[PDB]
């Protein structure tokens, strides 16, 4: 016996039928914007879990819970239970624990002046791209894709997207706030104030992450709000008439300095695989509608290695789930199935 | 000892030799790097701000730094240019008065000791700040980065001086400008909303935030993320009205805000907080750009009247710093107020 907390918590799936859930071994993981996350152990199953404790304010719409219950995908963190706690009201999401973040694993390689082996980039990025495909097919936008919100198991190579405190259904016509993502991963439309944006802000953030896994540092590290547009334009180059028109037409007579775009191949370190570069170029676009959809990205030639039936993880294990698509996932573009699920993986 | 070739800030536009010594770093940031040195010539302590600039971009810091002379603004003594690594870039070395402390440092000191700053010094510091804004807004210029980190001050004489003109730029009616601009705690709401047509009213908002934070003992609008800014504001100002929204940005006209009722101003600060100060913030931290006072209007306010009292003295028994020596320029904003701002006491 040790200190066991017992609470009455409602399943994440299912209809509001609470049950008693005991857990033990509570440790704090971290602390921030997201609230507080504890690690704990389910007494029942022995399994490890993250408990995310958000302070909530009834005055405001707090759509995290609604969305967490809505969804179920191997590349997204699972809500097991949730429950309420006591100065005011606290939401307690009980989620899948996962041992590491991309941020940290990347930071490790960075501190070792070592490039993360591409096979992991391909694994990690692919899986992110499925998690978006999925949330986006409900027209939900995460609006905080960054490395800290990408969890991974290093041994199993499984990635899981997390933190839906800023996620939200985006509806055509409705305007929404444009101070959203983290700075480095904030897409340029949002920096221009645009309220007419789409899902494809998350594809920009994804490209920023890919780039960062190939460089071993962030591709656009703005010193300050303003440096961010600088550090972007220094590589993307100055935008067309119609790129500005396509991000936010208020800037149509802004007069940016004229910078020639730094071609992609000279952005990346010299032994970098083309298809990495190629993909990267089709995510980090000014015109948002020019950026790949998440499913188009999964089908890119940069992930071909993963559809090889012989492929394995470096530690000798099998690759995780990569081809167990549902019709939800493929709604955006169902014929891609033929490329996405290779024959050996087909039922 | 190092000796470089450099150019007097005020005049004349002509290189001369300048020897300084005992360099030591003071800190790094978006601002570049600052060092302390002593001029070998006249013995003096000096701040050497060294930024890296990309010659393809309008780097308007030095022109602005040259057309300023004012007691509550850092004096630019000399400037020079060291060479950069890439051919597109270069080092600008502003050489300014060394002021020995900063407001961010002195509030974070008085707030470690779990208490408020002597209300005299809130009075003194905001006055001298609001003064320099008056001076610079008069030439069209907007600082665009008003925060306690950028307010140097001498603790003995209480002389405060505005600094870092890296984001500073002359606004000009009709032109569009980049919304994503100030430091985050102090970003005026219209900017959060994406307004490309903001005025120098933003710097007043920002000064409003600093007023708060000296009387609150810590920041008044601390977003733990970008989205939480507009939240932590609405939590104090309550929901904006269709008129207030329309004043900030036409596009959020249709945006479904939470209906939140304002938090009474006396109820925001400590119960023993002077109500003149409270009236002041009420008028500085208004959603609507125009409804915010000007800096000149702010200097001439009940809260600062204590400074005009002939019998006022610094609680270290010293005389005050030179609060009343206004120019014609400083007053252009609205010269009637000279009736209030300069008392009988001087003249
Ligand atoms: C200050 C700080 C900020 N970020 C972290 C941090 C550090 N290490 C790890 N390791 C993975 C631990 N397992 C976890 C963690 C969270 C979830 C879930 N939902 C599932 N599993 N995770 C995080 C982390 C990552 C995302 C969030 Cl929303 C919160 C945290 Cl604390 N610390
Ligand atoms: C990391 C960090 C961030 N801010 C600081 C910091 C700490 N201590 C002090 N003390 C005042 C020293 N004298 C000075 C300093 C600067 C100037 C001028 N222009 C004139 N005089 N100043 C700063 C500071 C404040 C504004 C700027 Cl732009 C730069 C710095 Cl380093 N350190
Ligand atoms: Mg930079
Ligand atoms: Mg908060």
Swiss-Prot record, chain B:
Reaction equations catalysed: L-seryl-[tau protein] + ATP = O-phospho-L-seryl-[tau protein] + ADP + H(+); L-threonyl-[tau protein] + ATP = O-phospho-L-threonyl-[tau protein] + ADP + H(+); L-seryl-[protein] + ATP = O-phospho-L-seryl-[protein] + ADP + H(+); L-threonyl-[protein] + ATP = O-phospho-L-threonyl-[protein] + ADP + H(+)
Keyword Membrane (UniProt): yes
Description of how activity is regulated: Activated by phosphorylation at Tyr-180. Inhibited by lithium.
Chief site of localization: cytoplasm
Keywords, in A-Z order: ADP-ribosylation, Alzheimer disease, ATP-binding, Biological rhythms, Carbohydrate metabolism, Cell membrane, Cytoplasm, Developmental protein, Diabetes mellitus, Differentiation, Glycogen metabolism, Kinase, Lipoprotein, Membrane, Neurogenesis, Nucleotide-binding, Nucleus, Palmitate, Phosphoprotein, Serine/threonine-protein kinase, Signal transduction inhibitor, Transferase, Wnt signaling pathway
Cell compartment(s), UniProt: Cytoplasm; Nucleus; Cell membrane
Highest rank taxon of the organism: Eukaryota
UniProt KW Magnesium keyword: no
Any GO BP annotation: positive regulation of gene expression
Binding site for ATP: 26-34, 49
Modified residues (Phosphotyrosine): 180
PTM text: Phosphorylated by AKT1 and ILK1. Upon insulin-mediated signaling, the activated PKB/AKT1 protein kinase phosphorylates and deactivates GSK3B, resulting in the dephosphorylation and activation of GYS1. Activated by phosphorylation at Tyr-180. Phosphorylated in a circadian manner in the hippocampus.
Active site: 145 (proton acceptor)
Known tissue expression: Expressed in testis, thymus, prostate and ovary and weakly expressed in lung, brain and kidney. Colocalizes with EIF2AK2/PKR and TAU in the Alzheimer disease (AD) brain.
Quaternary structure note: Monomer. Interacts with ARRB2, DISC1 and ZBED3. Interacts with CABYR, MMP2, MUC1, NIN and PRUNE1. Interacts with AXIN1; the interaction mediates hyperphosphorylation of CTNNB1 leading to its ubiquitination and destruction. Interacts with and phosphorylates SNAI1. Interacts with DNM1L (via a C-terminal domain). Found in a complex composed of MACF1, APC, AXIN1, CTNNB1 and GSK3B. Interacts with SGK3. Interacts with DAB2IP (via C2 domain); the interaction stimulates GSK3B kinase activation. Interacts (via C2 domain) with PPP2CA. Interacts with the CLOCK-BMAL1 heterodimer.
Remaining remarks: Higher expression and activity of GSK3B are found in the skeletal muscle (vastus lateralis) of patients with type 2 diabetes. Several potent GSK3 (GSK3A and GSK3B) inhibitors have been identified and characterized in preclinical models for treatments of type 2 diabetes.
Family to which this protein belongs: Belongs to the protein kinase superfamily. CMGC Ser/Thr protein kinase family. GSK-3 subfamily.
Protein name: Glycogen synthase kinase-3 beta
Organism annotation: Homo sapiens
């Amino acid at each position: 016996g040790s200190k066991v907390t017992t609470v009455v918590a409602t399943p994440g799936q299912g209809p509001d039928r609470p049950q008693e859930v005991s857990y033990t071994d509570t440790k704090v993981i971290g602390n921030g914007s997201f609230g507080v996350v504890y690690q704990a152990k389910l007494c029942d199953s022995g399994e490890l879990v993250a408990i995310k404790k958000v302070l909530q304010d009834k005055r405001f719409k707090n759509r995290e819970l609604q969305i967490m219950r809505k969804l179920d995908h191997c590349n997204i963190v699972r809500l097991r239970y949730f429950f309420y706690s006591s100065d005011e009201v606290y939401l307690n999401l009980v989620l899948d624990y996962v041992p590491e973040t991309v941020y940290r694993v990347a930071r490790h390689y960075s501190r070792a002046k070592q490039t993360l082996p591409v096979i992991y980039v391909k694994l990690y990025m692919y899986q992110l791209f499925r998690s978006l495909a999925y949330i986006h097919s409900f027209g939900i936008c995460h609006r905080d894709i960054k490395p800290q919100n990408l969890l991974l198991d290093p041994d199993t190579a499984v990635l899981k997207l997390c933190d839906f405190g800023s996620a939200k259904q985006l509806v055509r016509g409705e305007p929404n706030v444009s101070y959203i993502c983290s700075r480095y991963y904030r897409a340029p439309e949002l920096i221009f104030g645009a309220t007419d944006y789409t899902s494809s802000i998350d594809v920009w953030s994804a490209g920023c992450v890919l780039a960062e896994l190939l460089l071993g540092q962030p591709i656009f590290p703005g010193d300050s709000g303003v440096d961010q547009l600088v550090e972007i334009i220094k590589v993307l180059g100055t935008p067309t008439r119609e790129q500005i028109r396509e991000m936010n037409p208020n800037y149509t007579e802004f007069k940016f300095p004229q910078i020639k775009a730094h071609p992609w191949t000279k952005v990346f370190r010299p032994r970098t695989p083309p298809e990495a570069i190629a993909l990267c170029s089709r995510l980090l676009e000014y015109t948002p509608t020019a950026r790949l959809t998440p499913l188009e990205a999964c089908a890119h030639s940069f992930f071909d290695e993963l559809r090889d039936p012989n492929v394995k993880l470096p530690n000798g294990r099998d690759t995780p789930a990569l081809f167990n698509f549902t019709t939800q996932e493929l709604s955006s573009n169902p014929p891609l199935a033929t490329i996405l699920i290779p024959p050996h993986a087909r039922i």
